[PDB]
């Protein structure tokens, strides 16, 4: 019913849907847990000798400033053929390990090049990722990486013909962004739907006179592997009055595996809000943005500006034929890129909690009703009924670890009878009812 490793901190949680096995990324530790929260394997991951001025492998002659450094886990994703682990040490290099046999190593390049620094090398920065596959069945890895001290989003080979080139990205398989410390992405999550991959994050809206941080959803084709179809849309949760997106989830349940509505928690720069964003409207507005920037020079039919090129790339919206939309739905070498909407996507809060910083969101369905499991910075887990007639107030609240923020990696078990809830010191298997 609990897992509390004495003397270390938790960072990430992954669940193998085939197996039920849980995987924990911790400071200097990887644990494999059975669904019953029973320990099945441990793997030490640090400390090591490191500096952030230094490139792996770290050696005393080239890096005398090296020092004992802990290894907070930075990414932890289940792949078709392996478990993907990236730490925050050694420039965020990754490895792959056997599913169910966490202790044995499958793949790990012996001399990683500067194209294979995957995760964030600063534990105070986040890394988000998403496994997907190529048109040829190749397995790929989408990675969002916040600014530290490397492109903010990349598509990398998980099992390429040479194993040493693993986790590398091709020259066009990244989002080229210039003033990375000024934009200063903070990633929240990444998810797939249909033919697309999506990234939720925070960055500075340099288009705005105040240059304040702003939440965005962002979309790319899965086959593409080129970022030609990259398009960002700002989020407006009460017009952006709750500006800092913290966590989101799509409904997951025995009836609907993955829902069509994104439930996101936002925080004010204090109070929090829950805001729904229908995914067809998300796709509607990115479609408009792409369509306008391709064929009407970034403008609506009445001439109002609706789309532009972000990230200072030397690209422009154009006057391409309407046929380009059908001939190049995921873009091309010379279509305008990367694109953004001037028009936000709006949501009216379905909750407003005046003294709460939400940090985690899970949503499920019970006999047709939508329930939301919402964690906060204080280590509380709330339960809220989201259907018609709702109070907005939680019908239930439970302390997981006082003072210690609940982790985004809320996950249900295969039957949805339990929620796996995590703080910096403990992981619970919490029943959904009684």
């Amino acid at each position: 019913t609990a897992f509390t490793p004495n003397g270390t901190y938790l960072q990430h949680l992954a669940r193998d849907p085939t197996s039920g096995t849980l995987y924990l990324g911790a400071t200097n530790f990887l644990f494999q847990l059975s669904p019953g929260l029973q320990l099945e394997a441990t793997v030490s991951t640090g400390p090591v000798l490191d500096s952030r001025d230094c490139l792996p492998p770290v050696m005393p002659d080239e890096c005398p400033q090296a020092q004992p450094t802990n290894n907070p886990n930075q990414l932890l994703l289940v792949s078709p053929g392996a478990l993907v682990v990236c730490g925050s040490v050694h420039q965020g290099v990754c490895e792959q390990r056997r599913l169910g046999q966490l202790e044995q190593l499958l793949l790990r390049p012996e001399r990683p090049g500067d194209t294979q620094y995957v995760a964030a090398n600063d534990p105070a920065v986040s890394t988000v990722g998403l496994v997907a596959q190529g048109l040829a069945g190749e397995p790929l890895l989408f990675v969002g990486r916040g600014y530290t001290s490397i492109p903010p989003i990349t598509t990398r080979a998980l099992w390429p013909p040479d194993p040493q080139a693993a986790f590398s990205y091709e020259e066009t398989a990244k989002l080229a962004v210039g003033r990375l410390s000024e934009y200063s992405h903070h990633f929240v999550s990444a998810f797939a739907r249909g033919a697309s991959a999506y990234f939720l994050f925070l960055r500075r809206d340099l288009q705005a006179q105040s240059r304040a941080f702003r939440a965005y959803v962002s979309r790319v084709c899965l086959r593409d592997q080129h970022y030609y179809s990259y398009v960002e849309l700002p989020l407006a949760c009460e017009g952006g009055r709750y500006g800092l997106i913290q966590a989101a989830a799509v409904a997951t349940s025995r009836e609907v595996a993955h829902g069509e509505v994104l439930f996101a928690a936002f925080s004010s720069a204090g109070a929090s809000a829950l805001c729904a964003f229908p995914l067809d409207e998300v796709d509607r507005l990115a479609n408009r943005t792409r369509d306008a920037c391709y064929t009407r020079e970034g403008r609506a039919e009445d001439g109002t500006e609706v789309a532009y090129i972000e990230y200072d790339v030397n690209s422009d919206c154009a006057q391409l034929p309407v046929d380009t939309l059908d001939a190049y739905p995921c873009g091309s070498d010379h279509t305008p890129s990367p694109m953004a909407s001037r028009v936000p996507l709006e949501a009216t809060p379905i909750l407003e909690w005046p003294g709460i910083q939400l940090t985690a969101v899970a949503v499920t369905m019970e006999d047709g009703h939508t329930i939301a499991f919402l964690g906060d910075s204080q280590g509380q887990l709330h339960r809220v009924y989201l259907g018609p007639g709702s109070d907005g107030h939680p019908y239930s609240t439970q302390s997981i670890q006082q003072g210690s923020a609940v982790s985004r990696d809320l996950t249900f078990d295969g039957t949805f009878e339990h929620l796996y809830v995590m703080t910096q010191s403990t992981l619970l298997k919490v029943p959904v009812a009684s």
């Binding site: 609907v256 829902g259 018609p388």
Partner: peptide
């Protein structure tokens, strides 16, 4: 007013 989630469909009801 505030949106709610429609029972069974998960579709969002914008006004109650």
């Amino acid at each position: 007013x505030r949106p709610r989630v429609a029972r069974w469909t998960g579709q969002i009801i914008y006004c109650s």
